[model samples]
Target: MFKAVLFDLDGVITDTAEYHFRAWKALAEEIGINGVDRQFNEQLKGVSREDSLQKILDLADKKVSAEEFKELAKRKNDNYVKMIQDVSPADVYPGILQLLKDLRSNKIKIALASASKNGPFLLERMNLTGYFDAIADPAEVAASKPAPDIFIAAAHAVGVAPSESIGLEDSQAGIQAIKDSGALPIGVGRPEDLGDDIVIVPDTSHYTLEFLKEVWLQ
Candidate 1:
């Protein structure tokens, strides 16, 4: 049986990807870069700010000193933080509230394996910080996803072996890390966007404890 569930923050908990995109778009515009697309955002999911900035530079065919890139990314983060202050619990993905309540009531531990350090702030803003028992954001990690280190650390923090836990994510890299860490993965959106999972649900609304009990509760 699963002892815990590790969740991603942005697209999974709330649709904050737009804020990230807005920040990225503004920065890209300032830097004379174009062609930022959904695919680019998809690729960026679960990556740290520095790594994502490097990737963006590659995609834009632009070069800059690492220090300069870091400064620009920090500026973008400031924008993103301001933009996300308006986030609400109502913005949570469908069925997320009920699922969290049920899991907590059932005595199952909940871990947040977010890729970004802004995760804690956003979760609190969304009134979701009380839901999880452990977290592994970039602030506490050496590398970001598709690295399994953070998830592994999260499983340890939550006091569950990776095989005894489940990971919920909407990003390809996040799912990849979960798989590499030997946990069950439940894809929240397009399964094609991710690689493979123990189960693929259309959205959080379609996720049911009954389905999990039947499929992944072993």
Candidate 2:
């Protein structure tokens, strides 16, 4: 039913989301933003650095000038970069390798629509860099998720139409992007959390060719 499948890097593919949260948690502590828990980290997902810092400042309820904010952002990035430097094939979500193999075996084009600039490095770390047919550069895109531009760009980059492809996202945020981009949205989470408006695969292992057929068959 689709020629290509666009996958998100963090939640859909690997455990790097936790690394991002941890990096932010470390930086938040440095600036006295106490109790920056994982749930609190939700706002950090799929947002620009400026907006992310603004959320932290709102919680901090204090002014952090541009210089201070930039420094903190870089600190978080540095921590995250160092933290994920040791990632390996074992670090990918369970069944991702199998799913990728299956997708390739079926001749389905694979593309990455993640907003993370660190994708190339992490893919190399995961030993799965060669799997991508094309990767939409976050720099070339005008906006991020919920805008659908990234997914659209990815499908086009892979020589597939958005309507003839599937897109994977682990959260409600990227699902909207997939929906808006004219691709089928396959969310990798529980139904209650992601809502039942779209297809949900409760775990990464459940994302198989059969799973795709279940949704792709219409």
Candidate 3:
């Protein structure tokens, strides 16, 4: 039986990835980089702001001074923060809130394992902050996703062993981290995107209690 379910905030629980991509795209275009579309934006998922900036730079084959990089990252975050101000509970996906309720009723701990430092603010904005038993603190982790630190910390925070947890994520990096942390990796999107080793659902809309029960059985 699954004792916990760990969620990645943006693509897994809400649509903030569009906000993130808009900010990134604006910054990229302002710096003269074109072609930063959704496909490129996917590379930014489940990574730190610094890492995302580095990926954007690499995508453009560009380089900048350390201070310049810092400034750009800050600007992007400011834009993202501004963009998310209008977010509300209506932004949360279908079946997500009910799933959270069902998980709570079943005594399964709910943890958020997002790479975004803005996870709490976004959850609060969506009126969904109370749903989580643990929200991963990026500052406390030595490294981000694909390193397993965040997910490991989340499991510990929720008082569950990694093996007793199931991590739900839409990013390849997040799935890798969950797998490394000894949890079952439940991919939120296409299987090819998350990799063949992980189990996948089409999206969060499909992840109700019935689906998760089947996942546990698997």
Candidate 4:
């Protein structure tokens, strides 16, 4: 039986990607690195902070001291965080509210397995603070996505076992985390990156607890 459901914040629940793109572009310009377009920004999806910065640095063929790299990453994150303050319930995905409501009515456990440090703040900004029983804080864990720490911590937060839980993830790292955590992984992405024994959806419209039982049983 499904005891709990874990959700990834950005792509699955809502879109903070545009704000991240805006922040990255501004940061790249600040460092005299140009040409950080949409296609280029797409490359950083699901990537770590330092890795994204490293990509930009590579584009410019520029090198920076470790200290400077940290500060630059901070600047980009600060900008993105500030931009995300405008987030409201209006930014939520199309079918997510109904899914949450159904899950709530069914008394199913809900936890956030977000890799973002701003998980709580973003949920609050989006007026979605009350739905979640727990939100994984990576700082409290030994590792982040692709390591299963966040998913494991999230499942434990809501008194559920990972083996009895299902996870919603849009990134390869996050899907890997769910699999590693011993949960059923439901991915929201193209088949090109996520396939081979994993269930994938093109979008979140199919995200419903009723739908879960079908997949869970099959």
Candidate 5:
């Protein structure tokens, strides 16, 4: 009975986690901070840039002006975006485009709810700019992931009640936000404890339009 499907664009729709990690690691090291790596970077996924950087600084016992942090985050994103400039439609997750086509063909409303401030540019980079009916980033909403603001905004934007919507997410925070918004939640390649109702797929490679329809959309 779902009226819409909300997608999280980073890890769920595009492979941007590693890029974020690389940028953060480089920035952290450049600033003489230690203990930043792939493993640690995983902790920052699905969180806002401000929160993520503040967490790292808190851990490193470092102090910096908000302006400085913003500049550093911006620099990190520049590197990350440059790194993924070569990505194209062919590099999209297998069956993802097919799933989107299936959902759209079925006349189901589609929206995007993500915590990424880079949502727009990243979507364009991944060739997914026009796929969604609307996009709601955390910065535009009342709160970020692990809160219901983004998902609720997405559902409302698509003219659907939260319960009549579904969400696909890749991180614990993203899943929690969707649940709070009363959407059917699908966990993408994250560890268990994301939620009891979440279905964990290996990655977008294992996700298919037919699978989504049969398993979630109905």
Candidate 6:
């Protein structure tokens, strides 16, 4: 039986992916990286800011001194923070709020395990901070997604063993982290987007407690 549900903030709980894209895209274009569109931005999903910048730099065939990269990353994050300041409860994905409440009612602890350092800030801005029993982010871990550290920390934070938790994610790295953490990986996006090994829900548009328990418990 699943005792906890760990959520990834960007695509799983809310739609800050667009804000991230806009911020990164603006920075990319300002730095002469013209090809940083939504598709390219997708690669940054669930990625740490530094790693995301590395991917962006790789695509743009650009390089910078260590100090320059540090400055640029700071600039990009400042913009992202500004972009998400307007987020509110209305920004949460369609069925997620109800599902969270249902999980709470069922005694299933909730934890947030996100690669974004701004995960907690985003949750606060959205007025959804109280839903989680624990939250884990990149700042608290040495490694990012594809590394199980964050999810493992999350499971432990909620007092649940990893094997008894279900992690909901929209990125391949997030799914891999969940699997590595010994939890069931529930992909929130299209199957093709996440690969064939994981179980997928088309999107958060219809993810309910019943669906989760039905798929993972039996």
TM-score of each: 0.84, 0.91, 0.86, 0.92, 0.82, 0.87
- Which tens-of-lDDT digit does each residue in 9-125 have in candidate 6? 878888878988899999998898878888887688756689999998998579899999999999988998898889888888988889989988899999998877677888887
C-alpha lDDT of candidate 5 relative to the true structure = 0.78
Residues 140-217 of candidate 1: C-alpha lDDT, one tens digit per residue: 688778888788888899899988888888777778899999988888877677755357888888766666666674
Tell me how many clashing residue pairs each candidate has.
Answer: 1, 0, 0, 0, 0, 0
lDDT score at residue 45, model 1, on the 0-100 scale = 59
* Residue-by-residue lDDT tens digits, candidate 2, 48-130: 67787788778858787788888988888899889888888888898888888888888999899998898888888898877
lDDT of each: 0.80, 0.86, 0.87, 0.89, 0.78, 0.86
In angstroms, how far off is 108's CA in candidate 5? 1.3
lDDT of 1 at 188: 80
Residue pairs with backbone atoms closer than 3 Å in model 3 (clashes): none
Q: In terms of TM-score, how similar is model 2 to the real structure? A: 0.91
> Model 5, residue 151: what's the lDDT?
91
The residue-by-residue lDDT of candidate 4 on 51-135, one tens digit each, is 9999999996999998899999999989998898898989999788888888888888989998788889888877777789999
Sliding window of 10 residues with minimal summed lDDT for model 6: 40-49
Using TM-score as the measure, the top candidate is 4
lDDT of 1: 0.80
lDDT of 4 at 148: 92
Best-matching candidate per lDDT: 4
Worst 10 residues of 3 by lDDT: 40-49
Q: Give one digit per residue, the lDDT tens place, for model 5 in 80-193.
A: 877777667765677678788878888888888877667777777677776788888666677666888889999999899889887898778788888889988878775655
Residue 77's lDDT within candidate 5 is 76
How does candidate 3 score on lDDT? 0.87
Off by over 4 Å in 4: 63-67
Segments in model 6 whose C-alpha atoms lie over 4 Å from true places: 31-33, 43-67
Candidate 5: how large is its RMSD?
Answer: 3.0
